[PDB]
Ligand binder design. Structure first.
Ligand SMILES: NC(=O)c1ccc[n+]([C@@H]2O[C@H](COP(=O)(O)O)[C@@H](O)[C@H]2O)c1
Ligand SMILES: NC(=O)c1ccc[n+]([C@@H]2O[C@H](COP(=O)(O)O)[C@@H](O)[C@H]2O)c1
Ligand SMILES: NC(=O)c1ccc[n+]([C@@H]2O[C@H](COP(=O)(O)O)[C@@H](O)[C@H]2O)c1
Ligand SMILES: NC(=O)c1ccc[n+]([C@@H]2O[C@H](COP(=O)(O)O)[C@@H](O)[C@H]2O)c1
Ligand SMILES: NC(=O)c1ccc[n+]([C@@H]2O[C@H](COP(=O)(O)O)[C@@H](O)[C@H]2O)c1
Ligand SMILES: NC(=O)c1ccc[n+]([C@@H]2O[C@H](COP(=O)(O)O)[C@@H](O)[C@H]2O)c1
Ligand SMILES: [Mn+2]
Ligand SMILES: [Mn+2]
Lengths: 257, 247, 243, 249, 232, 260
């Protein structure tokens, strides 16, 4: 298929849906879906929903709200207490699924009460219209430039649950602890970082190519994260996303581990 | 002349050509030519061609194809066997000219079979042995004129650093083979994967000599052992780092 | 407010001014104002003024003049003799105010003699800072520039060379040239954010702390090059840049 | 307050004891006591005991045995099962005292068997007092400079210059020590020292290894990051980390 | 062994003892050849040398079994030393050796001996390798392994030395050595400290940049810098 | 078993030899033999021979001569022309054996003319240390016992190791390599190799020092270029490659190396 027919199929789904609620993350995919829904259905038939929670930063929430307002959409923030679900609070390995379940359950509630016919999300190759129309990554960038979309959150965040071992209980304080630690490291010029939480040990993951520059901050980072509540502040020798940059022989050894 | 005149004339040349095939590298120049062709003639009358070969990386090829796709052009990959020409195979100083010759000859074949009236490249003020046309250079475009018109048209994305031919990593007179080319390309691909986008693996038979910008060599130390063993599995006996730095 | 609202606030202000003179430094902010002024009012109603002086680099001046032409503006160079004011010449702590005064006084002269309704800056009261009137933040400046296709501007700005001298030290053509050659060489090695602070026979180099690790490979060349410029001791500040 | 008077006191206490067993660590203090006992009492009246256990490396044990042999002493190794005491096994803060108590209790068994009149230690001027072990250097009012002065006088130039600690220092209070995690810690430290880092600790935090190095060596350590990461993981750690505080942070 | 014959001729000696290997051998040979009661070891105390260097030398001379005597010199009372002129070394040498001769005259010593390589050790054609062999030979295991120079080297010529700026320089260098950099100078330029390190250690130093910056500032410096030329 | 037993064995071998010539390099092993020979047999019954040749530095020769004198031995320098043998001259893979052969022939000639019954060398586990079951740890333990404090702390090899097999040795390429190594040691790197690959110099450093080397990159590059090299490079495996790696990547660098 061509981009023109991939765009066809998508206007057809929106025209048929009439009124929609869109899960808006601020990324290129949700930006394109939100912009196409606005273009095809008009401002009065689209409501953009951005989720706020303890497992995502306030900064990403504020940015997502401002991006959706920019597109000229009616935007609604909704607050989720993910920690009320025991799977999330005790970080079971399927915590991801119960968070998504609670997330989509609240969007469906919003959509039922605003008269929207469906919830739309960004997913590419609830209704993922881009993925139904066989949109690839190259197709989303082509139509975004085509429609003049230049602004979107370029950095996709994870759930802070990523920083805790399975079985570790998440609390309001340890979450804030991890997030303050990561925010401080980014302020020193390390935008890609993780502070992994191991109770009284902080284990920092950095891209290995920056480990060398970092040394000048060892003492400042050590004492700052200690005031955040950690007793031991450490640097993971494997780096961020360990094993990914290794030779063929030691990539199959780190992966077997 | 004013920029509008240089642009206006360029639109006139495109209007007269009606249908064009564009040699697309991904740089600022070819991006500007491809965008003007799409604007003046429409998507159905423009074909973007990106060359794939043993002397250039798959990554550079994919980026150029995706950029032409991102501009709304119908883009077409074409593969050239540069090593079938003895001038390129034996890495003579004029190997570049026979490579450009072979590319422009294949561009004319593509244009003949799609009904294009001319081939366009990004050259600014072998290309004429093939009758390919530099429309920017006919319209008296300079580098500042190219950036001025690109900003005017909203072009923010293009390959900012033109990559070189891998023949650059072998001394003149060294015979290029599929194995030594593949060896160098895998080594550079591995080094770039570690976060060193500007890197050179110069080939000295059983010695690999790595050129890095001096300002990044400090950052490299953590990878010494992994780079040493990886390039040895590629076939090198000694893996070395040039103390002089890049170029 | 949305960016569209802030943009409209700015198109309206420019439309009301009709004719403007723009103090153009080449940075992201001055690039956005100059491009918006050209877009709303047209080339014939906008004048780009680039200041040439001894306290800012020739490189900064050359880039700004060619960038203003690349944006399609009529650009005009003006030269300011900052060292003619004794506060600047002897680098008293209020030297900045007299420098800004002399600059804005010359822009107002340029605007009066071409009939511009105001002087606009990138950010005096005789000038209008339209971006801050429309409540533009740094993130907004970036967004609107990407929206309009603006890709070229000086990404690191060098400021006034007077900042490199202690208060009370007299600025001279030779010590200025000494500092400027030293900083020019360091930037040539790949350090665009740098200061060479002048302490007579001591050079005190400020670098962003995250770059000092990478700098070691240049110690000996930097030492010998800055000594040939006239320094006797070439040092690196352990506090880093902005110490 | 004279060195000659302090030595005189030492030969008198040894002469009076007649037969002794000496707890020999290989340090300057135990070397000086062992050398003075040999000179005053003769080789047949002195037995040097070196402790072998899971909490010290085999290299440290072999070194002490050969050092005691080099002084001309009859030396006998004895092995202690420290992990049999619950205080040592579960790493309570008094583990040192129960380890030392068990050590001194075994010394008295050896001394009772060979007819020694006392057990002698290196201490200079806890569970030693309960066991009746004698600090002759401390009774003769030996200070550190007095021990160095007499060692120079006797030609003693060789002794362990760095006394190592119990491996228990690498485990948190409350963590249970096992034969495997001890072996894990010791192999990790042995590998790091082989790379040229003689002062190092691998602190044990279950699935995390936390390496303490002197901060002045951390810069040079970078070249070994990947090799250290994968080697300590093959020893059983899941995460291999470097303490940003450095050694003894 | 030109050495033992030279000592017998002096009969009674006072030894200028610095605590280094050279001075350590002289005191030990003098004590052995002439006896404890006929040798007097003098350790100099002054503002231009570290307390640690002095304390080690006094305690080490006692540990060798010698009668040790401290003597205090006020080098800054000499105008050449106080204003750090280029010949300050020579006027310092005068005060040091003049006070030893007073002590030697007052205890009946026949001469003052120093180390180097009346330096009887240097007269016997001893090299650096010869000093290490003979010290182990006599069981000598202890001595100050790092000899410091006069603190005056850290000040520019013409700068007036004060009790405070000397102490300032001494505390700064004491701090840097504590971090594992035994060869270091902090050169004094009023409000600027200029640190000299061996170039091979500058990489290893980076981890201490911030702590060194804040520590030397509390010592009184406003600017704490690292010399790109390295040490000497 | 014990050190006293192994040492006792040595004095017995020396007493039985009566008169000895000692091949003295200045290292700990030869220093131990030379001092024990002097101690057991006396100065008049031991002869120390130090070899000087074109494949070893003047500094190594001078240190060995000065150290053996410091132990009180009668020392004799002898000069070997290794380059006169074509196997050494053209750096064949067995060049080591013809060099050792020519060396030992001259020691035996010296020993015949001194009335010595054998030549003694420093080999460990007539190599008396190796016969007396001395290991590296026993030689270090016994050396401290006798007060041996001075010896060549970093033993250099023959310069032939710095050339690929088949490369012809000349005074100019030898002087080129040795000058490069002496310059690097002058910067504070006592263990270094400058391997010669025609227009490429490949520097081997202990991996624990390479980060510290960055400050010298430019000076080393330009200095070795004035020595005649066109490219000055650093081996990423370092000196003694593969000996410090982890378990799995040591056995893989083993099959990498044994592939040539
Ligand atoms: N199972 C899923 O579909 C899913 C989705 C999103 C995130 N995650 C989690 O995100 C984590 C990734 O961690 P980092 O991105 O911080 O490195 C993984 O633990 C992964 O389990 C999982
Ligand atoms: N004629 C061309 O189009 C062209 C362009 C860029 C580089 N080159 C070649 O690339 C080489 C430079 O190699 P490096 O950029 O890897 O250093 C030169 O030999 C040069 O001849 C040729
Ligand atoms: N006092 C002011 O309003 C004013 C204005 C502009 C610049 N400055 C000076 O600019 C200098 C900036 O120094 P840097 O060289 O570190 O950027 C400071 O001296 C600062 O005082 C001051
Ligand atoms: N209480 C004691 O007398 C005693 C004795 C031996 C070791 N220790 C322990 O040794 C530890 C120090 O060992 P590290 O070298 O690993 O830091 C301390 O926790 C200290 O409590 C204590
Ligand atoms: N001029 C002399 O004869 C003499 C004698 C002894 C020491 N010194 C001093 O030793 C100093 C050595 O300087 P450093 O601080 O770099 O070690 C010289 O500056 C010099 O002032 C000089
Ligand atoms: N019998 C032997 O194999 C033997 C003996 C002595 C020296 N060598 C040579 O000495 C070299 C040592 O090389 P480097 O010390 O320079 O690294 C060996 O690679 C080897 O070429 C070999
Ligand atoms: Mn870096
Ligand atoms: Mn180092």
């Amino acid at each position: 298929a061509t981009l023109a027919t991939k765009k066809a199929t998508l206007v057809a789904a929106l025209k048929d849906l009439q009124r929609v609620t869109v899960a808006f993350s601020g990324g290129i995919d949700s930006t394109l879906v939100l912009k196409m829904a606005l273009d095809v259905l008009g401002r009065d038939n689209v409501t953009a929903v951005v989720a706020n929670s303890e497992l995502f930063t306030d900064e990403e929430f504020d940015k997502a709200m401002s991006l959706a307002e920019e597109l000229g959409a009616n935007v609604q923030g909704t607050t989720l207490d993910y920690l009320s679900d025991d799977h999330i609070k005790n970080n079971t390995p399927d915590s991801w699924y119960y968070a998504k379940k609670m997330f989509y359950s609240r969007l469906n509630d919003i959509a039922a009460n605003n008269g929207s016919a469906a919830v739309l999300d960004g997913m590419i190759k609830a209704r993922s219209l881009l993925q139904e129309a066989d949109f690839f990554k190259t197709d989303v960038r082509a139509l975004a430039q085509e429609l003049g979309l230049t602004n979107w959150n370029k950095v996709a965040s994870c759930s802070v649950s990523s920083r805790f071992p399975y079985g570790t209980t998440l609390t309001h304080d340890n979450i804030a602890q991890v997030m303050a630690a990561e925010k401080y490291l980014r302020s020193l010029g390390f935008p890609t970082v993780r502070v992994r939480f191991h109770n009284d040990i902080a284990r920092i993951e950095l891209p290995e190519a920056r480990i060398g520059d970092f040394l000048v901050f060892n003492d400042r980072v050590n004492r700052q994260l200690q005031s955040l509540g950690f007793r031991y502040v450490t640097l993971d020798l494997g780096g961020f996303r360990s094993g990914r940059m290794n030779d063929t022989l030691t990539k199959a050894q780190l992966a077997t581990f």
